[PDB]
Amino acid sequence: KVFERCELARTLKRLGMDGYRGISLANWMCLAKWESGYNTRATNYNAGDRSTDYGIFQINSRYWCNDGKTPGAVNAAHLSCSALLQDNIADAVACAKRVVRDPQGIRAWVAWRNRCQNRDVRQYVQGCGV
Numbered sequence: 592k593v594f595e596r597c598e599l600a601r602t603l604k605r606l607g608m609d610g611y612r613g614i615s616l617a618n619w620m621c622l623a624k625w626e627s628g629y630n631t632r633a634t635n636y637n638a639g640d641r642s643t644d645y646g647i648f649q650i651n652s653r654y655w656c657n658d659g660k661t662p663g664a665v666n667a668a669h670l671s672c673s674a675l676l677q678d679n680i681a682d683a684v685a686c687a688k689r690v691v692r693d694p695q696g697i698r699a700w701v702a703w704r705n706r707c708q709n710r711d712v713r714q715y716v717q718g719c720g721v
């Protein structure tokens with residue numbers, strides 16, 4: 592599914608992402624925009640390390656979800672990567688909150704650093720009523 596901007600914003604609000612581990616809703620919005628353009632079916636194969644990024648948040652199969660074909664993903668995850676390609680983003684959100692529980696926080700996504708960090712991200716939530 593390709594979300595509309597404000598439709599996603601209200602959905603993330605409801606799933607309790609606003610201020611999760613100090614990260615504002617505008618920051619998660621900024622992240623989804625640059626990673627997948629708000630598309631839950633987005634997939635990116637990394638030929639260099641043979642891993643794949645999945646879904647709206649582009650979560651990687653080496654440490655977070657299991658897809659079986661990634662080398663050195665030596666078990667660990669238990670969530671199937673397939674769960675991150677659903678139209679319902681509940682699992683993807685549960686997973687993104689897991690990721691930021693680590694020290695790096697939102698900085699774990701290099702796209703966040705390139706495109707959102709130290710920037711005015713208010714634009715992503717402007718007019719959504721959240």
Ligand SMILES: N[C@@H](CCC(=O)N[C@@H](CS)C(=O)NCC(=O)O)C(=O)O
Nearest residue numbers: 654655656667668669670686687689
């Ligand atoms: N490799 C890390 C993270 C693996 C991990 O927690 N993945 C999450 C998805 S982001 C998961 O499998 N949750 C599935 C579940 O617990 O339903 C660990 O084992 O702590």
